[PDB]
Amino acid sequence: GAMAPSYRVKRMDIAKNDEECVVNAANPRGLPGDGVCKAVYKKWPESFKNSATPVGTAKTVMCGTYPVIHAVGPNFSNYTESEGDRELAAAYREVAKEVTRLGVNSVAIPLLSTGVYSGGKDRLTQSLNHLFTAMDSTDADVVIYCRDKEWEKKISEAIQMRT
Ligand SMILES: [Cl-]
Ligand SMILES: [Cl-]
Ligand SMILES: [Cl-]
User: Where does ADP-D-ribose bind?
Assistant: First the structure.
């Protein structure tokens, strides 16, 4: 684990991360998809061999020796608010188990279910709080990746508030 486990946020493409492993915001079928998923497919295509996994779960596939943790958050257009919230919390819990199993000292993670799976809603706080709930008991350095300037500021404020 990291000597002083921390959270940081960066506004840039997660495919250029400087961490020991990456979390993909995957679809259940292991398809190239859009957004973060498509960038992950371009950078680590080999990690999509047998990466299909149900909603609410995470499945790790190696690209060489670099781990890609495919985490499947719910599409809020299909799920009710309550069941979608439960699946979103479950996907992050499975990410924490995989990061721990891998023994990595750092992990790059996007906010699950905040893009095309958001159902047209702003889910920054909902997704980030589930990320904290799952990752707080791990000792890896967590680096959250985002693309919007306003979201970078809000995620940074949420991280600083707890320190
Ligand atoms: Cl970039
Ligand atoms: Cl999404
Ligand atoms: Cl964003």
Answer: 13, 27, 35, 115-117
Residue 82 has a CB neighbour count (10 Å cut-off) of 7
Strand order in the sheet with 58-63: 7-11, 141-146, 106-110, 22-25, 66-71, 58-63
Task: From residue 2, give the alpha-carbon distance in Å to each of 12, 102, 105, 151.
Answer: 23, 14, 5, 26
Check the annotation: does 35 bind a ligand.
Answer: yes
Say whether 30 counts as a known binding-site residue. no
Nearest ligand for residue 43 CA: 1
Question: Residue 151 in contact with residue 17, Cβ under 8 Å?
Answer: no
| Resolution expressed in Å | 1.5
What experiment produced this structure? X-ray
